Amino acid sequence: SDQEKRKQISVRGLAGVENVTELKKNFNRHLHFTLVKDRNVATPRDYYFALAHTVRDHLVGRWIRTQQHYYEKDPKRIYYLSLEFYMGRTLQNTMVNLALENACDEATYQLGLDMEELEEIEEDAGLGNGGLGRLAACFLDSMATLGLAAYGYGIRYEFGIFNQKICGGWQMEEADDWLRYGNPWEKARPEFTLPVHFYGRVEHTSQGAKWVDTQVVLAMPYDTPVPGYRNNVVNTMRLWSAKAPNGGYIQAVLDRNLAENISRVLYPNDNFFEGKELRLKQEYFVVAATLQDIIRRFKSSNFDAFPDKVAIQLNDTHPSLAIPELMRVLVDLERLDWDKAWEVTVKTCAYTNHTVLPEALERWPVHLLETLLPRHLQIIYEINQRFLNRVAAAFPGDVDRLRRMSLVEEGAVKRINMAHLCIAGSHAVNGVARIHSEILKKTIFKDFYELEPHKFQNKTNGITPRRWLVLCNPGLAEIIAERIGEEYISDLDQLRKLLSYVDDEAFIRDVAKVKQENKLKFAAYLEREYKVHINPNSLFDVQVKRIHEYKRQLLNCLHVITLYNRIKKEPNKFVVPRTVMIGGKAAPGYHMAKMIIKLITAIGDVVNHDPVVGDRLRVIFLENYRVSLAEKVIPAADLSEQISTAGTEASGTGNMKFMLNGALTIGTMDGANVEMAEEAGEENFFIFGMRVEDVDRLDQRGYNAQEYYDRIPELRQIIEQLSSGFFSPKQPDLFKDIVNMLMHHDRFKVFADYEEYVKCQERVSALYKNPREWTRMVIRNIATSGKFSSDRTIAQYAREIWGVEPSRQRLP
């Protein structure tokens, strides 16, 4: 009796067995009881919510069963700490991974509703800036699919990356109020709310050190379920929210907003460091809370065993404070000896580097750290002293090496090099692509690689074949399925078997049919939502990614102006029709990126209205590029632009998405482009321009953009057009800053790759003129994209870093 009567309370029976009858029944239940509405007044969004709740209900039993499982079994747990999780929409992905997509589709049909229309109501969970944030998301999905006891820990931003609008040809930012109508996926967990301390001071009592007189901010966790692919595994992504603890009474209540501002907005900086204190607060916030929850879970089924049960993976140096924080807790609170604590920390943490550009790396002024986190700065200084002590003993007399490896950067404003802190405190540091990992060992991390070679590894990036194929390209996924089955969805290497169809007329006809369907659908979407008309019988040339100087959208601009100038030159000469699409957001305070977006639209203003050009060349800027737009435009792309200056793009992932969806790649030998060309065969790729050693040689003697301007008539014509106001009649000097940078301050040598790029583009159109051959080369790409599935990347992290074994064994 009594406590035995609570056995009734169980997950035992849910909404049935996963079919149409019960699904409709539950959709109805949610529409009336959850939305307190009826068919007469239900709005489309209401219907979207009804469906989402019905679908989420299917997650619960598995969600609870999975966490119970990890508790029972107690496997080593993997913690992915990141300040970004670019998740995009969840509805379709959840249905796909639970195998409910067809049933929901039928159920909503019989209820007279259109599921596709409803799925469009859901807005992106854009809690990320780009690559790094999307990778976290692909990683969550792969770890679930691989049966890993993995937890994604981040910040629940009230406002994700701003929604971009184009006004007058310029980018205008708008707050991304994504939680306005609520979030059907998350589940708050008040009982797990934790305190995070700021400021205060440090007093050294008999015992040890004490952090006193601090300002407290509470961290409330919100759980979102992450389902593996049909294995009945549902993992958790825990995002922390800032809550105030509990000039007059009124103002004091209004001021609660100050402490809760911590989790308000995602800093919109992609590959750029801004040392704003609010950002440092967000970083410590997610770290402190996350570590408390990790230790709690560790204590609930001494610290010697911590590394055997815990793996903390740092996505960049953003959550690097986890290293000194873990030490603070172990030494200050758990009273462990410094060295034993240090051993534990290094064995627990592993750091992932995502770039090599100096401006993108974190260097926090010490004054900011001493006022905001006094004891962390003290611990960092002690970590430094003991680390430098080791290099001094390993390289006696090498004082300059000491200076270069120090965690502290002397100068006008003393700063703390976060990347150095991570290497000292992690047992593994990794690059995200073979070429990037190698550059790390030879350049920026060279000193460290010499002191501890074992520490450095490579983990080439990936994307999940679920969201990035099955989800976004059902057509491609089905034709691939009719030939080789469905086992590829969680074994992408099987795509290899498609090579056997390179000469199959049916498959060749199918691949091209699917691509043109997607191109048709995307064109319909653009005209409906933006009243933008694009020629579906043109070659879709697409470059989507954040606007950057290093990504060289500018190089792409030079090419489209060349295409236009050549046409005007020889109007009656035939050219492969092209629809050049460029999309991506610019960080708010990044002037040049904002100038580039304006140049793109400026070019379009001329090109798209020239009667002699007509249907032959259209240049359009895809507004507000985000995960959901990527799922639409990438499957409709013919040519994938991946033209970053060699050695600047650590890896790239969009490149992989394009390859997996039937697009041929034109790019440099940079990041993962190198490994993609190796997998398909360079004969099936469109590699061009300088190689890393080539830019290095150019650097040694000096890059003089004037030389290329003096030597290339076609290039001179374009710059003259830009300078003279040909693309800005009403404001002639509008692009002077772009021209000036190109001519005298181009760190990315655009002019130096112009000629080879244009010629390589000629060969792309030459191949496009032959559909059959274009299609056959596409096949050889898709068939070799298998190594770029995040399941492979994750399996390597697991076995080579975390020390855990992946598994595709389903749960009941």
Ligand X SMILES: Cn1c(=O)c2c(ncn2C)n(C)c1=O
Ligand Y SMILES: CC[n+]1c(C)c(C(=O)OC(C)C)c(-c2ccccc2Cl)c(C(=O)O)c1C(=O)O
Alpha carbon distance 710, 702 (integer Å): 16
State yes or no: 644 annotated in a binding site.
no
Which DSSP category does 9 fall into? S
* Rounded-to-integer distance, Cα 663 and Cα 670, Å: 18
- SS3 assignment for 752-792: HHHHHHHHHHHHHHHHHCCHHHHHHHHHHHHCCHHHHEHHH
Does residue 57 bind a second copy (CB under 8 A)? yes
**Which one of residues 102, 203, 212, 256 is an interface residue with a second copy (CB under 8 A)?**
256
Q: Is 130 in the site for ligand PLP (CB under 6 A)?
A: yes
Rounded CA-CA distance 741/754 in Å is 16
Q: Is 653 in the site for ligand PLP (CB under 6 A)?
A: yes
Q: How far apart are CA 438 and CA 458, in angstroms?
A: 8
- Residue whose structure tokens are 């003089």: 704
CB closer to ligand X, 589 vs 732? 589
Tokens of 750: 């655009």
Give 590 or 754: the residue with its C-beta nearer to ligand X: 590
The pair of three-digit structure tokens given for residue 332, joined into one six-digit string: 């200050």
SS3 668: coil
Which one of 9-17, 584-592, 675-683, 702-710 is the stretch in contact with ligand X (CB under 6 A)?
584-592
Burial of 299 (0-12, 13-18, 19+ CB in 10 A): exposed
**Candidate ranges 266-274, 613-621, 684-692, 709-717; the one touching ligand X (CB under 6 A):** 266-274
Q: Does 9 bind ligand Y (CB under 6 A)?
A: no
Q: Interaction with a second copy in 196-235: which residues (CB under 8 A)? A: 223
Residue closer to ligand Y (CB basis): 58 or 363: 58
CA distance 742 to 414: 33
**Cross-strand bridge partners of residue 618:** 579
300 in a known ligand binding site: yes
Q: Which residue has 């795509």 as its token pair? A: 495
State the minimum distance, in angstroms, from the CB of residue 585 to ligand X. Answer: 10
- The SS3 assignment for 227 reads strand
Number of residues that bind ligand Y (CB under 6 A): 14
Residue 90 CB contacts under 8 Å (≥ 6 apart), including other chains: 52, 122, 125, 185, 224
- How many residues in the chain? 812
The two tokens of residue 501 are 């169809």
Q: Specify the amino acid at residue 38.
A: D
Of 3-11, 289-297, 334-342, 512-520, the segment contacting a second copy by CB under 8 A is 3-11
Among 587, 650, 715, 782, contact with ligand X (rule: CB under 6 A):
587
Dist. CA 565–CA 105, nearest whole Å = 49
Instruction: Residue 5: name its binding partner from a second copy, ligand X, ligand Y, none (Cβ under 5 to 8 Å by kind).
Output: a second copy
Is 626 marked within a binding site? no
Shortest separation between residue 269's beta carbon and a second copy, angstroms: 10
Smaller CB separation from a second copy, 247 or 611: 247
Task: Give least dist CB 633 to ligand PLP, A.
Answer: 10
In single-letter form, the type of residue at position 95 comes to M
Helices (H) and strands (E) in the chain, counts: 32, 25
CA distance 695 to 749: 8
712 phi/psi in degrees, rounded to 5: -120, 100
Collapsing DSSP to helix, strand or coil, 254 comes out as helix
Q: How far apart are CA 105 and CA 115, in angstroms?
A: 6
Give CA torsion, residues 507, 508, 512, 515, to 10 deg: 50
Q: Please, which residue, 520 or 811, has the CB nearer to ligand Y?
A: 811
Interaction of residue 654 with ligand PLP, rule CB under 6 A: yes
Which of 297, 347, 446, 594 touches ligand Y by CB under 6 A? 297
Query: What is the distance between the alpha carbons of residues 478 and 657, in angstroms, rounded to a whole number?
Result: 17
DSSP state, residue 594: H
Interaction of residue 189 with ligand Y, rule CB under 6 A: yes
Q: Which of residues 522-551 bind ligand X (CB under 6 A)?
A: 548
Rounded CA separation 759/666 (Å): 11
Q: Does 585 bind a second copy (CB under 8 A)?
A: no
Sole binder of a second copy in the list 99, 278, 305, 811 (CB under 8 A): 278
Q: Does 686 bind ligand X (CB under 6 A)?
A: no
Establish if 297 lies at the interface with a second copy (CB under 8 A). no
Q: Looking at this protein, which amino acid is placed at residue 272?
A: F
The annotation status of 301 as a binding-site residue, yes or no, is yes
Report the alpha-carbon distance of residue 2 to residue 4 in Å, rounded: 5
Query: At 87, is the secondary structure helix, strand, or coil?
Result: strand
Q: 68: Cβ–Cβ under 8 A, 6 or more apart, which residues?
A: none
Binding mask 587-626 for a second copy (x = CB under 8 A): -xx-------------------------------------
> Which partner from the list ligand X, a second copy, ligand Y, none does 181 bind, CB cut-off 5 to 8 Å by kind?
a second copy
Q: How far is the CB of 254 from a second copy (least distance, A)?
A: 6
Q: Note whether 672 and 650 are within 8 A (CB).
A: no
Q: Hey, which residues are catalytic here?
A: 354, 545-546, 551, 653, 657
530 touches, from ligand Y, a second copy, ligand PLP, none (C-beta below 5 to 8 Å by class): none
Q: Is 38 annotated as a binding residue?
A: yes
64 is a contact residue toward ligand Y (CB under 6 A): yes
**By CB under 6 A, how many residues form the interface with ligand X?**
8
Residue 272 binding result from ligand X, ligand PLP, a second copy, none, given CB thresholds of 5 to 8 Å by partner type? ligand X
| 626 near ligand PLP, judged by CB under 6 A | yes
Instruction: List the interface residues with ligand X, window 346-385 (CB under 6 A).
Output: 359
Q: Is 272 in the site for ligand X (CB under 6 A)?
A: yes
Query: CB–CB of 612/567 below 8 Å?
Result: yes
Contact 570, 609 (CB under 8 A): no
Please work out the total of residues on this chain that contact a second copy, with binding judged by CB under 8 A.
69
Q: What, of ligand Y, ligand X, a second copy, none, does residue 261 touch, CB below 5 to 8 Å by kind?
A: a second copy
Number of other CB atoms surrounding residue 632 within 10 Å: 15
Residues near ligand PLP, by CB under 6 A: 130-131, 134, 545, 625-627, 630, 652-655, 657
Which residues in this chain contact a second copy in the complex, by CB under 8 A?
2-3, 5-11, 14, 24, 27-28, 31-33, 35-40, 42-43, 45, 57, 60-61, 63-64, 68, 110-113, 159, 162, 173-175, 177, 180-182, 187-188, 190-191, 223, 243-244, 246, 248-250, 252-254, 256-257, 261, 264-265, 267-268, 276, 278, 588-589
Which residues define the annotated binding site?
Answer: 38, 71, 296-301
Residues of the shown chain interacting with ligand Y in the complex, contacts defined by CB under 6 A: 36-38, 41, 63-64, 67-68, 71, 189, 191, 223, 297, 300
Binding site for AMP: residue ranges?
Answer: 38, 71, 296-301
